[PDB]
């Protein structure tokens, strides 16, 4: 999947781009509806942040057009323009590269972001990954209505956390718990084991149970002092 999608999207790269805007939901739909570079949004990180992808001409026109009437747009450096009608006319190569998959049952509840529902392990095929590639991903809705299902540990697995803001500003407004913890794995200014251990400890001090014997595979237990009690004087007359 990874390599085939990679060099099938290599062919259409160099042609079209992406820009992040934060102005409104159906607001931005109305803004570029006077254009027909796009059929549906690309992604929805939060209730107030959206990404607009497509051909360079319309994207430049919208960036310079809204540059004077709202929140500044950040052009993401993407060689191509995914989640756009640009995908359609190149389906067939994809189908003939990944039409040989065997979907196995999933142990854990893989919660989809393109079908907005809990999928099963046997429903993953060539159109499933196309559909993923073509239309929206509903990430903010998925994280919000996963927070309502009783999940309170959104541990991210990435070399650099870029969606912590959206995750917190999405879980903030849901009718669940507020102290749900969100931690990354590695940051820009470190890739050693110390940073990973600090992220693990940050996740641990909020409820997550961490087994610490793996990081010390060559030590023996020491003799440690006992619990320091805090005492007052309780004394009824004897």
């Amino acid at each position: 999947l990874v390599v085939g999608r990679s060099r099938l999207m290599r062919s259409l790269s160099g042609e079209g781009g992406m820009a992040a805007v934060a102005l409104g939901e159906a607001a931005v739909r109305e803004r570029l509806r006077p254009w027909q570079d796009r059929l549906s949004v690309a992604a929805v990180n939060g209730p107030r942040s959206v990404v607009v992808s497509g051909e360079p001409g319309a994207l430049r026109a919208f960036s310079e057009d809204c540059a004077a009437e709202g929140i500044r747009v950040r052009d993401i450096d993407v060689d191509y323009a995914s989640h756009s009608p640009q995908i359609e006319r190149v389906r067939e190569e994809l189908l003939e590269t990944t039409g040989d998959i065997a979907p196995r049952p999933a142990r854990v509840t893989f919660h989809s972001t393109v079908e907005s529902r809990s999928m099963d392990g046997t429903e993953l095929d060539a159109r499933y990954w196309y559909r993923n590639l073509r239309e929206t991903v509903r990430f903010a809705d998925a994280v919000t209505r996963l927070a309502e299902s009783g999940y309170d540990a959104f541990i991210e697995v990435s070399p650099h956390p870029v969606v912590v803001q959206a995750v917190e500003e999405a879980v903030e407004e849901a009718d669940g718990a507020e102290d749900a913890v969100v931690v990354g794995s590695l940051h820009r200014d470190g890739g050693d084991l110390s940073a990973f251990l600090r992220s693990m400890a940050t996740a641990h001090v909020s409820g997550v149970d961490i087994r610490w014997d793996v990081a010390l595979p060559g030590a023996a237990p020491f003799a440690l002092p006992t619990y320091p009690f805090q005492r007052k004087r309780y004394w009824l007359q004897p």
């Binding site: 065997a102 979907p103 196995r104 049952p105 046997t122």
Partner: protein
């Protein structure tokens, strides 16, 4: 308790030799006599021979059908029991147990399953089974060697499946059937690993 460790199974050609090996841990091997018991399908246990420990001689005794065909040796310094078979026949595809003691068969080892075969490896031929009597299945026929794995709906349907052991026919190739039951789309996936084939056959409901 004490552990008897056994090895030496595999594929054999009818008419050649093969030697087993059984080591003992936890007790002195130089004081016990050792007996050998073969186990083949369609029959019960069968004593095939026994050897005497040292300080009582080194006499060996065998069965009527194997006297002059098999031999049993031992080494008490390195403490193994060996069974050496010459001119094997196709009816001796069996699992061999080594038993401590000449008459009181006190202990029984885990055993090794060694088989003499005249046929070569062969991919299976899966045929659908149309109900003409609800139940439906597929037949795996003319394959070699064991084992094979059968699955329904890529591991989704696991209830009502009735696989059967592959009974050796008179030819020398294996054939079993897998039938599920459903009241009233339906495919069975048969995987033969040592020949690396995976067939997905649909069965008419």
């Amino acid at each position: 308790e004490v552990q008897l460790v056994q090895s030496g199974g595999g594929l054999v050609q009818p008419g050649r030799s093969l030697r087993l090996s059984c080591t003992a841990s936890g007790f002195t091997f130089g004081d016990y006599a050792m007996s050998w018991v073969r186990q083949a399908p369609g029959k019960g246990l069968e004593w095939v021979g026994f050897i005497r420990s040292k300080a009582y001689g080194g006499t060996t005794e065998y069965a009527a059908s194997v006297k002059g065909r098999f031999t049993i040796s031992r080494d008490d310094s390195k403490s193994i029991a060996y069974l050496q078979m010459n001119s094997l026949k196709t009816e001796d595809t069996a699992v061999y147990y080594c038993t401590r003691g000449g008459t009181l068969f006190d202990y029984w080892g885990q055993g090794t399953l060694v088989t003499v075969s005249s046929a070569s490896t062969k991919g299976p031929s899966v045929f659908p089974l149309a109900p003409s009597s609800a139940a439906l299945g597929c037949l795996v026929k003319d394959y070699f060697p064991e084992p094979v794995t059968v699955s329904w709906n890529s591991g989704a349907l696991t209830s009502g499946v009735h696989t059967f052991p592959a009974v050796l026919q008179s030819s020398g190739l294996y054939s079993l059937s897998s039938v599920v039951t459903v009241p009233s789309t339906y495919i069975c996936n048969v995987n033969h690993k040592p020949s690396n084939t995976k067939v997905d056959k649909k069965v008419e409901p």
